[PDB]
Structure 1
């Protein structure tokens, strides 16, 4: 149900995101009306496992601060050359 997500605080230097994307973690943002801009870290293995069950445009469960606020996926990045996810914009409902 609830998924842990460590928050990435401050400026993420390019080598930080580069050597993180070579390890299995993807940045992401969660916002809406009430909660705004918690730049957090999301795992690539569990996210695909939840998207295989709920779908691409469904409601994806995720713990924003160790709590579920029924966040919905708005858009996501993807590079066609490696089959690796890049970023998610997590609109809070």
Structure 2
């Protein structure tokens, strides 16, 4: 329940997004009270393992840069045709 995240810089284009998805990463957001809205990237395999161990509706204390945030999953965009995840929204419950 100790995921990591790397912050996406500004203006990610289509090409770099799909390169990131060709790699094992996935884009995500973090919003909610306690922090402002931030756009990040996450490893798909590690996220899947965390979900396997904690459950769909569970809490994760993931690391964003310097700090850590307790967070729950709100929604996720998924590609059923190649069975991979393509986006994930994180909600800070605090």
What TM-score, normalized by structure 1, do the two folds share? 0.90
How far residue 63 of structure 1 moved from its aligned partner, in angstroms, is 1.1
CA distance, structure 1, for counterparts of residue 27 and residue 72 of structure 2: 16
RMSD, matched Cα: 1.4
Q: How many pairs were matched up?
A: 93
Say whether the 8 Å CA contact 2:2–2:63 is kept in structure 1.
yes
Aligned residue for 1:39, secondary structure, equals strand
Say whether the 8 Å CA contact 2:25–2:42 is kept in structure 1.
yes
How far residue 9 of structure 1 moved from its aligned partner, in angstroms, is 1.0
Q: Classify 1:71/1:86 alpha carbon distance in 2 versus 1 (closer, same or farther; 3 Å).
A: same
CA distance, structure 2, for counterparts of residue 36 and residue 90 of structure 1: 12
- 5+ long unaligned stretches in structure 1: none
- 5+ long unaligned stretches in structure 2: none
Aligned residue for 2:50, secondary structure, equals helix
Cα deviation digits, residues 64-91 of structure 1 (max 9, x gap): 2343321111111101111111111110
CA distance, structure 2, for counterparts of residue 83 and residue 61 of structure 1: 26
How far residue 55 of structure 1 moved from its aligned partner, in angstroms, is 1.0
Say whether the 8 Å CA contact 2:58–2:73 is kept in structure 1.
yes
Residue of structure 2 in register with 1:46 after alignment: 46
Say whether the 8 Å CA contact 1:4–1:66 is kept in structure 2.
no
